[PDB]
Structures are given as C-alpha cells and as structure tokens.
C-alpha cells in the first residue's frame, strides 16, 4: 500500500499574489488505486488553493490491495514554487461526521511573544498554528526530527504519532509539535530544537 | 509496524567544531521491537558521529508483530542542534553482503557549476551528493515534495520510491533527487523546484 503519483500544481494566482498557503484534505482510495470522496478540511487563505488541489487529486494514483478510507494530507505551498504533500491521520471529523471535534486553547510562548488559538483535538499543534498564520519551525513533519521541538508547560498532549523523543524526554515535557494533538488547553514554548538535542 | 522511540543525541564535539554531518546505518528489529545487528554504512565526516549514533540506537524502540531485517536510516546533523532521522530502503549491500554495489558517475549541473562523484546503485542521488559534501536542497526527504527537484539530461534513474511526480513529468525528465537511484552514469540539473511546479 503506497502512493505512486500525487502531483500538485502551483496556482499562478498564488504565485502572483506572493501568498504562501496550506490545504488539509480528506480522501478515500479505491481498490484500483484512484482517489474519490475528496473533501477539503481547511484552506489558508481561502479561495486560492483548494479548488485546484481537488482537481489535481482526481489524477492521483496509489498501489493498493484493497480500498482505504479517510486518508488525510496536508499540502503546503511556499515561495519560489515549493509544494509538499504530507500524510496525516484521519478522524471521525475528517471523514465528514456530524458535529465538531472538541477544541482546546493553545497558548504558544514564542521568541517574539505569546499567541493563542483554538486547536481541534484531531489537528496537530503545528497545523493549527499554521492555520492561524503563525510560522513555526519544521522539516520532516513526520515526528522524526528536532525541528518542531517545544516544551510543554501546562496541560496534556497526545504524542502517539511522534517517534524521535524517548520516554524520558516526553516525561520531561518535550513535544514534537508536528505530531502532537492537544487533549486539554496547553501552553507550549516553541523554537526549542537546540535545547532538545543539547 | 512502526518506530516508537528513536532518540539521537548531538555529539558535543561536532557542535564545538561547527561540523554538520550525516550517518547512514543499517539495523534489524527484534520481535520485541529492539534494535540489533547495527552497522554504519557511511559517516561524513568520519569519526565524529558514528560511534555515538550506534550507542543511541541500542535504546531505540519499535512496535512490531515480527522481526524485521535490514532497515536503513539516514541521520542528518545540522547547525543549531538540528537532527533528523529518515527511513530509506535496505539492499544486499546495506545488509553487509560480500562485494560492492555497482557504482555510477553522477554529474550535477548546479547554479554554481558542475560537480561529479560516484553513486552506488543502492544509494539515492541526494545522499551520495551529501557524502561528497555538496549542499543540495531538500525538505521532506520522502519523495513527496518539489524541494529536491532536478532535470535528468542523460542516463537513466530508478525513481520507484518517489511519488510527487506524475507519469508525464517523469517522462519529461523530472527527478526527485532524494528518492532516485542511478542505474547508469547520469547528468542532472539541480535546483529546479521552481521550474517543476510552474
Ligand atoms: S518537523 Fe520533524 S518531528 Fe516535527
Ligand atoms: S525532499 Fe521532498 S521529494 Fe525530495
Ligand atoms: K469511502
Ligand atoms: K537479522
Ligand atoms: Ni514515562
Ligand atoms: Ni510514461
């Protein structure tokens, strides 16, 4: 089971406007490996990337032994033509269920001051920060490096999807923000990569 | 089957020396999820990161239904405490087999001029360029973005491990250098991300 072809085109209007952006989208895969049941979960900013991404996804291809439901990706667009497609985890809410995920208030303590936003319980800290237009560090986006490291000051997180931290570090409050969901209101100090690996 | 804890520490001597680096290492996983049969494949530069990485890997943890052989990761160390662990694909050669993989000459045509090095048939273009001390762009390292894009001018590649390019783009000569192996001598123009997604 794996992706074969997942091309995304860069919308010329975004390029022209000098807009960076982000789409999170859910889809199913058929036993033939084609993509259907596509639903945009979020698009930042709105009306620039979503429609084009859905069009592109019609031509995606996977290899699979059976249909697969409720896949989710993040599609990030940055300056100078950069696009990346990152796999995330589907939830009841991503699949299109009735009602809204519980959401919690995230307080980030950043080198340039504090910021606060809502984060659904099925969205990673990083993603919700990006949706609020905050620029947090990252590189792998796969819970497998130090880039997105922060320190949890209060509250509780689910970091089941991370892997670069050991037991000890999690217990000491370390967080990989690309792979962590809030399960309460939380306060996280960001930009702590260098402190993590020291 | 998945990684749970893969902590790597930053060697203080590397920090002090202002050295960036890279280790590629093979290991097996036990049915208990512990790591054994560890062998460094390459370390750049030598004698700075390898021994410490092997020590760290003794404490790694996986979840698994059965033992798994001949896993390989790349471990990259950059300035300001950055470490990332990226999964790659094992080969006869990574497992420790007799004799050497066939190797091919890679010619890179970079914005700052041309460079040439050997690349084994079981090592990705990006990795071999990094081992030769060339700084090529990348971000996901998972064949799922535009960052490492180049244009294949001559020769042939295996890009089975990539997924962001479609059929058409591969046929036109596009290459994701983080996920491409040479199967002949090749010439690749690098730094073509913006041209790819345009
Ligand atoms: S960006 Fe690598 S662990 Fe979050
Ligand atoms: S770095 Fe993303 S495809 Fe190579
Ligand atoms: K379905
Ligand atoms: K073994
Ligand atoms: Ni613990
Ligand atoms: Ni073709």
Short mmCIF file of C-alpha atoms and ligand atoms in Angstrom, two decimals:
data_model
loop_
_atom_site.label_atom_id
_atom_site.label_comp_id
_atom_site.label_asym_id
_atom_site.label_seq_id
_atom_site.Cartn_x
_atom_site.Cartn_y
_atom_site.Cartn_z
CA UNK A 1 0.00 0.00 0.00
CA UNK A 2 1.60 3.29 -1.07
CA UNK A 3 1.29 6.50 -3.07
CA UNK A 4 2.51 6.36 -6.67
CA UNK A 5 1.64 9.72 -8.16
CA UNK A 6 0.45 12.71 -6.16
CA UNK A 7 1.22 15.72 -8.35
CA UNK A 8 0.04 19.13 -7.21
CA UNK A 9 0.32 22.20 -9.41
CA UNK A 10 1.15 25.67 -8.12
CA UNK A 11 -1.80 28.08 -8.73
CA UNK A 12 -0.48 31.02 -10.73
CA UNK A 13 -2.64 33.47 -8.80
CA UNK A 14 -0.98 32.46 -5.52
CA UNK A 15 2.43 32.94 -7.12
CA UNK A 16 1.39 36.40 -8.41
CA UNK A 17 -0.06 37.48 -5.06
CA UNK A 18 3.05 36.27 -3.15
CA UNK A 19 0.78 34.16 -0.94
CA UNK A 20 2.00 31.07 0.93
CA UNK A 21 -0.65 28.60 1.90
CA UNK A 22 -1.92 25.32 3.23
CA UNK A 23 -4.71 22.88 2.43
CA UNK A 24 -5.76 19.91 4.52
CA UNK A 25 -7.90 17.45 2.63
CA UNK A 26 -9.50 14.06 3.18
CA UNK A 27 -10.00 11.40 0.51
CA UNK A 28 -10.61 7.70 0.02
CA UNK A 29 -8.66 5.30 -2.23
CA UNK A 30 -10.43 2.73 -4.43
CA UNK A 31 -9.26 -0.85 -4.92
CA UNK A 32 -7.97 0.42 -8.29
CA UNK A 33 -5.75 2.94 -6.51
CA UNK A 34 -7.71 6.04 -7.61
CA UNK A 35 -8.83 8.87 -5.31
CA UNK A 36 -12.51 9.71 -4.55
CA UNK A 37 -14.77 11.13 -1.81
CA UNK A 38 -12.43 14.16 -1.62
CA UNK A 39 -13.25 16.87 0.94
CA UNK A 40 -11.19 19.95 1.79
CA UNK A 41 -10.92 20.23 5.59
CA UNK A 42 -9.28 23.65 5.61
CA UNK A 43 -7.64 26.10 3.21
CA UNK A 44 -5.45 29.00 4.29
CA UNK A 45 -6.05 31.57 2.96
CA UNK A 46 -9.45 30.71 1.48
CA UNK A 47 -10.28 30.57 -2.23
CA UNK A 48 -6.70 30.37 -3.54
CA UNK A 49 -5.59 26.72 -3.40
CA UNK A 50 -8.48 24.42 -2.56
CA UNK A 51 -10.32 24.10 -5.87
CA UNK A 52 -7.09 23.46 -7.77
CA UNK A 53 -5.93 20.86 -5.28
CA UNK A 54 -9.18 18.92 -5.58
CA UNK A 55 -8.79 18.96 -9.37
CA UNK A 56 -5.23 17.70 -9.11
CA UNK A 57 -6.22 14.92 -6.71
CA UNK A 58 -8.59 13.45 -9.30
CA UNK A 59 -5.46 12.15 -11.11
CA UNK A 60 -3.63 10.77 -8.10
CA UNK A 61 -2.54 7.15 -8.10
CA UNK A 62 -1.85 4.61 -5.39
CA UNK A 63 -0.84 0.96 -5.27
CA UNK A 64 -3.22 -0.99 -3.01
CA UNK A 65 -4.56 -4.47 -2.23
CA UNK A 66 -7.95 -3.06 -1.09
CA UNK A 67 -9.86 0.24 -0.76
CA UNK A 68 -8.68 2.57 2.03
CA UNK A 69 -10.90 5.13 3.74
CA UNK A 70 -10.36 8.59 5.20
CA UNK A 71 -6.78 9.38 4.25
CA UNK A 72 -5.72 12.93 5.02
CA UNK A 73 -2.87 15.01 3.68
CA UNK A 74 -1.53 18.45 4.32
CA UNK A 75 -0.47 20.34 1.20
CA UNK A 76 1.83 23.26 1.92
CA UNK A 77 2.70 25.95 -0.66
CA UNK A 78 5.69 28.24 -0.03
CA UNK A 79 7.54 30.89 -2.03
CA UNK A 80 9.60 30.07 -5.12
CA UNK A 81 7.34 27.20 -6.23
CA UNK A 82 7.65 24.93 -3.19
CA UNK A 83 4.86 22.37 -2.62
CA UNK A 84 4.91 19.44 -0.19
CA UNK A 85 2.37 16.71 0.47
CA UNK A 86 2.44 15.22 4.00
CA UNK A 87 0.33 12.31 5.22
CA UNK A 88 -1.66 12.78 8.43
CA UNK A 89 -4.24 10.68 10.32
CA UNK A 90 -7.99 10.65 9.63
CA UNK A 91 -10.54 11.09 12.43
CA UNK A 92 -14.35 10.91 12.71
CA UNK A 93 -14.33 14.63 11.93
CA UNK A 94 -12.11 14.40 8.82
CA UNK A 95 -14.41 11.71 7.39
CA UNK A 96 -17.23 14.25 7.43
CA UNK A 97 -19.13 13.24 10.58
CA UNK A 98 -21.90 15.32 12.21
CA UNK A 99 -20.85 17.84 14.85
CA UNK A 100 -17.47 19.38 15.62
CA UNK A 101 -14.41 17.90 17.32
CA UNK A 102 -13.75 19.16 20.84
CA UNK A 103 -11.32 22.07 20.59
CA UNK A 104 -8.81 23.43 23.07
CA UNK A 105 -6.95 26.67 23.51
CA UNK A 106 -3.27 26.54 22.65
CA UNK A 107 -1.01 29.22 24.11
CA UNK A 108 2.38 29.41 22.35
CA UNK A 109 5.29 31.16 24.03
CA UNK A 110 7.48 32.13 21.06
CA UNK A 111 10.77 34.04 20.93
CA UNK A 112 8.75 37.01 19.61
CA UNK A 113 5.97 36.76 22.23
CA UNK A 114 2.82 34.85 23.05
CA UNK A 115 -0.03 33.82 20.76
CA UNK A 116 -3.22 31.91 21.37
CA UNK A 117 -5.59 29.98 19.10
CA UNK A 118 -8.11 27.14 19.09
CA UNK A 119 -6.88 23.66 18.06
CA UNK A 120 -9.34 20.79 17.40
CA UNK A 121 -8.49 17.53 19.19
CA UNK A 122 -7.89 15.91 15.79
CA UNK A 123 -5.45 18.52 14.48
CA UNK A 124 -1.77 18.74 15.27
CA UNK A 125 -0.39 21.76 17.10
CA UNK A 126 1.77 22.77 14.12
CA UNK A 127 -1.15 22.58 11.68
CA UNK A 128 -3.46 24.72 13.86
CA UNK A 129 -0.65 27.27 14.32
CA UNK A 130 -0.22 27.39 10.54
CA UNK A 131 -3.97 27.88 10.11
CA UNK A 132 -3.71 30.89 12.47
CA UNK A 133 -0.88 32.21 10.29
CA UNK A 134 1.97 31.59 12.76
CA UNK A 135 5.34 30.48 11.35
CA UNK A 136 6.70 27.65 13.46
CA UNK A 137 9.79 25.61 12.54
CA UNK A 138 9.58 22.20 10.96
CA UNK A 139 11.33 20.00 8.46
CA UNK A 140 10.38 16.32 8.36
CA UNK A 141 6.74 16.82 9.53
CA UNK A 142 6.84 13.14 10.42
CA UNK A 143 7.62 13.14 14.14
CA UNK A 144 11.16 12.03 13.28
CA UNK A 145 13.45 15.08 13.95
CA UNK A 146 14.09 18.02 16.33
CA UNK A 147 12.97 20.92 14.13
CA UNK A 148 9.49 21.46 15.60
CA UNK A 149 10.56 20.83 19.24
CA UNK A 150 8.86 22.63 22.06
CA UNK A 151 8.43 22.38 25.83
CA UNK A 152 5.00 21.62 27.31
CA UNK A 153 4.46 23.98 30.28
CA UNK A 154 0.91 23.03 31.17
CA UNK A 155 -1.85 20.70 30.04
CA UNK A 156 -1.66 17.38 28.25
CA UNK A 157 -0.87 16.20 24.73
CA UNK A 158 -1.27 13.07 22.70
CA UNK A 159 2.07 12.38 21.00
CA UNK A 160 1.33 8.83 19.91
CA UNK A 161 2.31 9.76 16.34
CA UNK A 162 5.82 11.02 17.22
CA UNK A 163 8.95 8.86 17.40
CA UNK A 164 12.13 10.96 17.77
CA UNK A 165 11.66 11.68 21.50
CA UNK A 166 12.33 8.92 24.01
CA UNK A 167 10.25 8.07 27.11
CA UNK A 168 12.41 10.23 29.31
CA UNK A 169 12.13 13.35 27.14
CA UNK A 170 8.35 13.09 26.85
CA UNK A 171 8.17 12.72 30.64
CA UNK A 172 10.32 15.88 30.97
CA UNK A 173 7.82 17.88 28.84
CA UNK A 174 9.36 17.70 25.37
CA UNK A 175 6.94 17.95 22.43
CA UNK A 176 7.24 17.50 18.65
CA UNK A 177 4.61 19.98 17.58
CA UNK A 178 4.12 18.44 14.09
CA UNK A 179 2.89 15.19 15.66
CA UNK A 180 1.15 16.31 18.87
CA UNK A 181 -2.59 16.78 19.47
CA UNK A 182 -3.99 18.72 22.44
CA UNK A 183 -6.23 16.82 24.79
CA UNK A 184 -6.71 19.88 27.04
CA UNK A 185 -5.80 23.56 26.86
CA UNK A 186 -1.98 23.64 26.63
CA UNK A 187 0.92 26.09 26.90
CA UNK A 188 3.98 25.30 24.78
CA UNK A 189 7.28 27.11 24.48
CA UNK A 190 8.34 26.89 20.82
CA UNK A 191 11.64 27.04 18.98
CA UNK A 192 13.40 24.70 21.44
CA UNK A 193 15.19 22.44 18.95
CA UNK A 194 18.65 23.43 20.19
CA UNK A 195 17.73 22.81 23.82
CA UNK A 196 16.23 19.43 22.98
CA UNK A 197 19.33 17.85 21.42
CA UNK A 198 21.99 19.54 23.64
CA UNK B 1 4.78 -1.88 12.50
CA UNK B 2 6.32 1.49 13.37
CA UNK B 3 9.03 3.39 15.21
CA UNK B 4 8.23 4.42 18.80
CA UNK B 5 11.41 5.96 20.14
CA UNK B 6 14.43 6.84 18.02
CA UNK B 7 16.31 9.45 20.04
CA UNK B 8 19.66 10.65 18.76
CA UNK B 9 21.90 12.92 20.81
CA UNK B 10 24.02 15.70 19.33
CA UNK B 11 27.76 14.99 19.90
CA UNK B 12 29.24 17.97 21.72
CA UNK B 13 32.47 17.77 19.72
CA UNK B 14 30.55 18.25 16.45
CA UNK B 15 28.79 21.26 17.95
CA UNK B 16 32.15 22.72 19.10
CA UNK B 17 33.82 22.12 15.73
CA UNK B 18 30.86 23.66 13.81
CA UNK B 19 30.63 20.46 11.76
CA UNK B 20 27.44 19.35 10.01
CA UNK B 21 27.20 15.69 9.22
CA UNK B 22 25.45 12.56 8.09
CA UNK B 23 25.36 8.90 9.07
CA UNK B 24 23.69 6.11 7.15
CA UNK B 25 23.19 2.98 9.21
CA UNK B 26 21.59 -0.43 8.86
CA UNK B 27 19.92 -2.37 11.66
CA UNK B 28 17.46 -5.17 12.34
CA UNK B 29 14.43 -5.08 14.66
CA UNK B 30 13.62 -7.98 17.03
CA UNK B 31 10.13 -9.32 17.66
CA UNK B 32 10.36 -7.36 20.94
CA UNK B 33 10.85 -4.13 18.99
CA UNK B 34 14.51 -3.62 19.98
CA UNK B 35 17.35 -2.80 17.58
CA UNK B 36 20.33 -5.13 16.85
CA UNK B 37 22.80 -6.11 14.10
CA UNK B 38 23.64 -2.40 13.72
CA UNK B 39 26.19 -1.43 11.05
CA UNK B 40 27.24 2.08 9.99
CA UNK B 41 27.19 2.27 6.18
CA UNK B 42 28.79 5.71 5.96
CA UNK B 43 29.69 8.64 8.20
CA UNK B 44 30.50 12.13 6.92
CA UNK B 45 32.90 13.36 8.15
CA UNK B 46 34.43 10.26 9.75
CA UNK B 47 34.94 9.72 13.48
CA UNK B 48 32.53 12.41 14.71
CA UNK B 49 29.01 10.95 14.73
CA UNK B 50 29.06 7.21 14.06
CA UNK B 51 30.06 5.75 17.43
CA UNK B 52 27.55 7.93 19.28
CA UNK B 53 24.75 7.06 16.89
CA UNK B 54 25.34 3.33 17.36
CA UNK B 55 25.20 3.84 21.13
CA UNK B 56 21.96 5.77 20.86
CA UNK B 57 20.39 3.13 18.62
CA UNK B 58 20.83 0.49 21.33
CA UNK B 59 17.88 2.17 23.13
CA UNK B 60 15.57 2.55 20.15
CA UNK B 61 12.09 1.09 20.30
CA UNK B 62 9.63 -0.12 17.70
CA UNK B 63 6.17 -1.66 17.73
CA UNK B 64 6.13 -4.85 15.62
CA UNK B 65 4.28 -8.12 15.05
CA UNK B 66 7.50 -9.90 13.92
CA UNK B 67 11.25 -9.30 13.47
CA UNK B 68 12.24 -7.03 10.54
CA UNK B 69 15.59 -7.21 8.76
CA UNK B 70 17.87 -4.66 7.13
CA UNK B 71 16.22 -1.35 7.95
CA UNK B 72 18.27 1.68 6.99
CA UNK B 73 18.09 5.27 8.16
CA UNK B 74 19.88 8.44 7.32
CA UNK B 75 20.73 10.62 10.32
CA UNK B 76 21.49 14.21 9.41
CA UNK B 77 23.08 16.72 11.83
CA UNK B 78 22.93 20.45 11.03
CA UNK B 79 23.83 23.65 12.85
CA UNK B 80 21.97 24.87 15.93
CA UNK B 81 21.22 21.36 17.23
CA UNK B 82 19.20 20.00 14.30
CA UNK B 83 18.99 16.20 13.92
CA UNK B 84 16.64 14.26 11.63
CA UNK B 85 16.14 10.54 11.16
CA UNK B 86 14.86 9.47 7.71
CA UNK B 87 13.94 5.94 6.68
CA UNK B 88 15.49 4.55 3.50
CA UNK B 89 15.47 1.14 1.77
CA UNK B 90 17.85 -1.75 2.55
CA UNK B 91 19.75 -3.57 -0.22
CA UNK B 92 22.03 -6.63 -0.39
CA UNK B 93 24.91 -4.22 0.21
CA UNK B 94 23.38 -2.50 3.27
CA UNK B 95 22.80 -5.91 4.88
CA UNK B 96 26.56 -6.47 4.78
CA UNK B 97 26.92 -8.73 1.73
CA UNK B 98 30.25 -9.63 0.06
CA UNK B 99 31.46 -7.35 -2.72
CA UNK B 100 30.48 -3.80 -3.64
CA UNK B 101 27.35 -2.46 -5.34
CA UNK B 102 27.83 -1.33 -8.93
CA UNK B 103 28.52 2.41 -8.87
CA UNK B 104 27.92 5.08 -11.47
CA UNK B 105 29.22 8.56 -12.12
CA UNK B 106 26.80 11.35 -11.34
CA UNK B 107 27.39 14.72 -12.97
CA UNK B 108 25.43 17.54 -11.30
CA UNK B 109 24.88 20.82 -13.13
CA UNK B 110 24.30 23.26 -10.26
CA UNK B 111 23.69 27.02 -10.30
CA UNK B 112 27.29 27.41 -9.09
CA UNK B 113 28.80 24.99 -11.62
CA UNK B 114 29.32 21.30 -12.28
CA UNK B 115 30.39 18.57 -9.87
CA UNK B 116 30.93 14.86 -10.32
CA UNK B 117 31.01 11.92 -7.90
CA UNK B 118 30.42 8.18 -7.70
CA UNK B 119 26.98 6.96 -6.53
CA UNK B 120 26.35 3.28 -5.67
CA UNK B 121 23.26 1.77 -7.32
CA UNK B 122 21.70 1.37 -3.86
CA UNK B 123 22.19 4.98 -2.73
CA UNK B 124 20.00 7.91 -3.62
CA UNK B 125 21.41 10.81 -5.63
CA UNK B 126 20.88 13.26 -2.75
CA UNK B 127 22.65 11.01 -0.24
CA UNK B 128 25.72 10.48 -2.47
CA UNK B 129 25.88 14.24 -3.11
CA UNK B 130 25.79 14.84 0.65
CA UNK B 131 28.56 12.27 1.13
CA UNK B 132 30.66 14.27 -1.37
CA UNK B 133 29.93 17.40 0.67
CA UNK B 134 27.59 19.08 -1.83
CA UNK B 135 24.62 21.04 -0.44
CA UNK B 136 21.52 20.19 -2.44
CA UNK B 137 18.01 21.32 -1.49
CA UNK B 138 15.54 19.07 0.26
CA UNK B 139 12.79 19.14 2.82
CA UNK B 140 10.55 16.08 3.12
CA UNK B 141 13.24 13.54 2.01
CA UNK B 142 10.31 11.24 1.30
CA UNK B 143 9.73 11.65 -2.43
CA UNK B 144 6.64 13.72 -1.60
CA UNK B 145 7.52 17.39 -2.47
CA UNK B 146 9.32 19.63 -5.01
CA UNK B 147 12.32 20.72 -2.93
CA UNK B 148 14.92 18.30 -4.34
CA UNK B 149 13.67 18.55 -7.96
CA UNK B 150 16.08 18.26 -10.83
CA UNK B 151 16.07 17.58 -14.57
CA UNK B 152 17.64 14.38 -15.94
CA UNK B 153 19.73 15.32 -19.00
CA UNK B 154 21.24 11.93 -19.76
CA UNK B 155 21.22 8.38 -18.46
CA UNK B 156 18.59 6.50 -16.51
CA UNK B 157 17.25 6.53 -12.97
CA UNK B 158 15.14 4.34 -10.78
CA UNK B 159 12.52 6.55 -9.12
CA UNK B 160 10.27 3.79 -7.84
CA UNK B 161 10.46 5.30 -4.34
CA UNK B 162 9.17 8.77 -5.37
CA UNK B 163 5.51 9.80 -5.51
CA UNK B 164 5.10 13.57 -6.06
CA UNK B 165 5.86 13.48 -9.81
CA UNK B 166 3.25 12.12 -12.20
CA UNK B 167 3.85 9.83 -15.20
CA UNK B 168 4.09 12.76 -17.55
CA UNK B 169 6.72 14.63 -15.53
CA UNK B 170 8.94 11.57 -15.14
CA UNK B 171 8.68 11.00 -18.90
CA UNK B 172 9.73 14.66 -19.43
CA UNK B 173 12.92 14.10 -17.35
CA UNK B 174 11.88 15.34 -13.91
CA UNK B 175 13.69 13.78 -10.93
CA UNK B 176 13.23 13.90 -7.15
CA UNK B 177 16.84 13.51 -6.14
CA UNK B 178 16.05 12.33 -2.56
CA UNK B 179 14.28 9.23 -3.95
CA UNK B 180 16.18 8.45 -7.16
CA UNK B 181 18.91 5.84 -7.70
CA UNK B 182 21.23 5.85 -10.73
CA UNK B 183 21.14 2.79 -12.93
CA UNK B 184 23.75 4.25 -15.31
CA UNK B 185 26.01 7.31 -15.33
CA UNK B 186 23.65 10.31 -15.20
CA UNK B 187 23.69 14.08 -15.65
CA UNK B 188 21.18 16.05 -13.57
CA UNK B 189 20.48 19.76 -13.43
CA UNK B 190 19.72 20.61 -9.79
CA UNK B 191 17.78 23.34 -8.04
CA UNK B 192 14.79 23.09 -10.42
CA UNK B 193 11.97 23.16 -7.86
CA UNK B 194 10.51 26.39 -9.23
CA UNK B 195 10.53 25.12 -12.80
CA UNK B 196 8.90 21.85 -11.77
CA UNK B 197 5.74 23.31 -10.21
CA UNK B 198 5.30 26.33 -12.56
S1 LIG C 1 9.24 18.52 11.90
FE1 LIG C 1 10.44 16.74 12.27
S2 LIG C 1 9.50 15.96 14.13
FE2 LIG C 1 8.24 17.65 13.67
S1 LIG C 2 12.90 16.42 -0.49
FE1 LIG C 2 10.75 16.20 -0.80
S2 LIG C 2 10.71 14.89 -2.60
FE2 LIG C 2 12.82 15.02 -2.20
K1 LIG C 3 -15.41 5.59 1.19
K1 LIG C 4 18.87 -10.27 11.39
NI1 LIG C 5 7.25 7.82 31.04
NI1 LIG C 6 5.47 7.17 -19.05
#
